[PDB]
């Protein structure tokens, strides 16, 4: 049985995601256009920049998040942004041809497109494997939103100060999730589903680390960092 509090948490997170993820992708017309050797860097930098803004807007709505110091909010968002972008992108990802399909041909991104943003298969191959293994969980939208919120409120991000508080917020989300699965996810889809979802959070840490390495390498060249956005530079370094 989901308590009243746990049902509330899910309603809040569903709404927060609905208010921050336009599944029609209408705002993509505002990005510098896709061109198809770092020819996708302007478009994809704009997409990621927009996505960071949407991730922040979702985070602010996570119950308990606002109770954190303004400093702990910052550290959590800086370290998780790329991971929550990779998670929320699973909604446009399609196993049909292993691409992110955002409404139209111009806005359909494949392995070649990511490599034309400056990344290598060292990143891209595990990223597609992650997206595939995530889609294969066939998560309920309730689970998807709890996983993103649990990803953001992680007490072990380096620089976190009030870890005991971040832990308490996350536990209340983790318990909600464990209870949701038990109450509302029918077998066989439910079999070790929580353990599997937690495994996706570890896979994201490894994705974050390789993304960071390639981003530092990309952005060290002032001519590439010139093509990024002020928000990407601020959040990614």
């Amino acid at each position: 049985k989901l308590s009243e509090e746990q049902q509330h948490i899910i309603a809040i997170l569903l709404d927060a995601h609905h208010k921050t993820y336009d599944p029609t992708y209408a705002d993509f017309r505002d990005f510098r256009p896709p061109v198809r050797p770092l020819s996708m860097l302007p478009h994809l930098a704009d997409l990621v920049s927009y996505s960071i803004q949407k991730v922040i807007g979702f985070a602010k709505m996570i119950p308990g998040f606002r109770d954190l110091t303004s400093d702990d909010q910052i550290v959590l968002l800086k370290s998780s942004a790329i991971e929550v972008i990779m998670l929320r992108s699973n909604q446009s990802f399609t196993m049909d041809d292993m691409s992110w399909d955002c409404g139209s041909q111009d806005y359909k991104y494949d392995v070649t497109d990511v490599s034309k943003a400056g990344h290598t298969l060292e990143l891209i191959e595990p990223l597609i494997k992650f997206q595939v293994g995530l889609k294969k969980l066939n998560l309920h939208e309730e689970e998807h939103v709890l996983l993103m919120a649990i990803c953001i409120v992680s007490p072990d991000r380096p620089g976190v100060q009030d870890a005991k508080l971040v832990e308490a917020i996350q536990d209340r989300l983790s318990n909600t999730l464990q209870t949701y699965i038990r109450c509302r996810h029918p077998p066989p889809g439910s079999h070790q589903l929580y353990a599997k979802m937690i495994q996706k959070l570890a896979d994201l840490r490894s994705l974050n680390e390789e993304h960071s390495k390639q981003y530092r390498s990309l952005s060290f060249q002032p001519e590439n960092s010139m093509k990024l956005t002020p928000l990407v530079l601020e959040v990614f370094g």
Binding site: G57, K60, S70, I74, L77, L231, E234, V235
Partner: peptide, 10 residues
């Protein structure tokens, strides 16, 4: 210092 992230967080 993260002025833009700070502003977006309210």
């Amino acid at each position: 210092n993260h002025p833009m992230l700070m502003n977006l967080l309210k």
